[PDB]
Symmetry: C3
Subunit: 312 residues, 3 copies
């Protein structure tokens, strides 16, 4: 059955994966279908036989253990091989020289780089598929895929859901990517954020265009929480505020702990792309609704399906 799905046509095949804007609702539906079978296969066989003759390089100019190890494990559980490039402390060879070098060894490269334009360098020069693992934190498409997959799997549907984004919605680009992916579905969105860290006007206008913008609030109210199906939290960082007083104030209001979960639904899904500071208290980690570690498991099967589609 996975064989049939992977034989089906896809925009992923032999393609760079650089932006969520490349892919359709149909593309993601197939990805999630294959992801579902990837999980069943792994439960049965552990290491599958899909990409046995393929080699993936991972090329992370800044470390992200959660992302790089996810791709390594996905590739190896597809039966493929991985070559993780040591992240140097360096000044060094140009990105395009390194990519063209590694393209002689591997069939695809996962690239994470602090320059947003790194995706344009990859497009111009790299003769094998490049998967964007983070381009100056502008986009992180497989994080967007796994976030959406997490919602679908935790709550079973997409229609009728209310999603509450809380924290730094200006710098929290995973929110923007997920807002783009949500344009097809009949959802409602609540934006809880300091006034300084609200969504960029273009992303807000995306929600307006879709008839999805429900409420905008500085405060994480019992009322907002009471109607939340998905509480998607972002990291609030001190550099976003000139004064410490304001920074700690906003943190204390937004901290997700038992004091705030008591206003949520029994079925609210608490999500966080991670790393976290203290915006989600450790005391809630064992709560049913704490889904930010299931998120990582969902990402494995999503990236297995992505790698299968790209390199098969």
């Amino acid at each position: 059955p996975l064989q049939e799905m992977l034989a089906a046509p896809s925009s992923f095949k032999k393609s760079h994966v650089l932006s969520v804007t490349q892919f359709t609702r149909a593309d993601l539906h197939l990805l999630f279908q294959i992801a579902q079978e990837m999980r069943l296969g792994v439960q049965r066989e552990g290491v599958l036989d899909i990409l046995r003759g393929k080699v993936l390089c991972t090329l992370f100019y800044e470390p992200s253990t959660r992302t790089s190890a996810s791709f390594d494990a996905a590739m190896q559980r597809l039966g493929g091989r991985t070559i993780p490039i040591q992240t140097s402390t360096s000044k060094g060879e140009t990105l395009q020289d390194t990519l063209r070098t590694l393209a002689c060894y591997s069939d695809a490269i996962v690239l994470r780089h602090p320059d947003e334009k790194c995706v344009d360098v990859a497009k111009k020069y790299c003769p094998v598929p490049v998967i964007n693992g983070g381009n100056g934190s502008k986009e992180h498409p497989t994080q967007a895929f796994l976030d959406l997959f997490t919602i679908r799997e935790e709550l079973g549907t997409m229609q009728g859901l209310t999603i509450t984004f809380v924290g730094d919605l200006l710098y929290g680009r995973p929110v923007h990517s997920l807002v783009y992916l949500l344009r097809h579905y009949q959802v409602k969105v609540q934006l809880v954020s300091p006034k300084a860290l609200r969504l960029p006007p273009a992303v807000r206008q995306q929600l307006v265009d879709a008839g999805q913008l429900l409420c905008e609030s500085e405060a994480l109210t019992p009322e907002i929480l009471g109607r939340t199906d998905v509480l998607y939290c972002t990291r609030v960082q001190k550099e976003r505020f000139p004064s410490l007083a304001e920074f700690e104030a906003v943190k204390d209001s937004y901290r997700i702990d038992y004091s705030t979960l008591k206003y949520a639904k029994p079925t609210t899904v608490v999500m966080h792309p991670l790393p976290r500071n203290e915006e989600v208290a450790e005391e809630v980690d064992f709560d049913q609704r704490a889904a930010y570690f299931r998120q990582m498991c969902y990402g494995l099967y999503c990236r297995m399906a992505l790698l299968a589609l790209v390199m098969s």
Copy 2:
């Protein structure tokens, strides 16, 4: 035959491997039996087919090439897959967040961490087996296993042996772990150490309880050496002494070179957990009795058998 042994019941199966205190004489006998077959299998096939669908993460917060590469090679020679997590220079994500992340990718994690309590964090939070590769140097259970295996294999038995521990017996915790493992057998122990760096009273009292304590000496005498079956050396570090004069004095007395081996038995086994400074001179490396590199080979088969038992 390995298949039969691995089908046999074991305390290792699906278990954390955190302390030598978890396991019995029977547990270790089975481990060593399987280790013996692991060596035969490797000699015949190089890479076996025991853990083909399993994935091991190695998570070393401080480097130990001898330990991490041993586990990587053992896992891969079992036919499994390995994901070695780059040791960062970092301040970073909490240990429990990282473990729960990597548990979504792998079936077991080998963890080395500078906090002794890291084993308690792993117990509370990690939903897959964690193997302790060193917890603030308090314990290193697979080092204890391979040390004991080395003795069994080099000398053929455990009964009637005299073991001489030399060096820093206060901070040299591999000695303490091995003393615990030796409680079942009819051995005699000689402790050669500066008075400041003698065994902790509890560990000494362990030897007394077992009727194994033979002699305690500041000097590495021709008499002590003449009755030594196993000379287990530890690193003496300058920080253990306020003055340089005392540090160099103790080093010169304890240095194992041809000048000191001439008093040993033709069959004395010279062991060292490594890394070494100068307490074992390079001139003895090619001597039959120099077993600290065979130790590493023995560790490979011991860790192959451990990984097989835990994850099969």
Copy 3:
């Protein structure tokens, strides 16, 4: 057919690969033959089944992504396993201790080390084959092999060729190694270099002995370029010159860009061992004659064949 070639006798089998001076014209002919089949196999199967039960360690004391990842990918595309040792920032264990440790885990080690004498340490102490990935930049034998292979493959022959070495021919040791490998063939050599950075007298005298030295020039003339079949460029580094003025002067004269390629042949092969600074302009990267990335692909198949011969 690869099976027959690999069954054929070879100086590579079970041997250290430390210097180009170890191997004959016959040895290299077989290597290149096998390399050719390695490429066909990879095109068909991606990952072959030649070294399925073998384990390669890569041990790089200074990073060289192009070299270490090439060996990793070659080993894995032979169906073998790889254990890449993290390059530390460290003061640490002696080289011989580390090698003897890793020899207990792997069947061969690729070693790159800043001490030229590291090859002598490996010879004395390491009980498995060591492949020299760079010994204080004195030798880099597999780079020499792939350079020669690149010429053979790009131009089809070795007889009648004119090779032009340009840049730092004093510190550019890949030139010296390639000059040694070229002693069998009827080639002519042009040496374009500043007078301070000319070839060492012994290497020049090698070319004289072989009846291959054609011309020595400070300037990269239209005449020299017009007769060049292979333009092998080396990096010119500022430390080679006391004054910046001279350094930039020599760089501007030697920079390979369209302004200089217009004097070359339509068939001139532009080679560079890499990394490059600006001595080969990015504008020529898409030119047919720009072979420094095909070089890397050729290196993969060369190292596949080398690893097959050593460890089969």
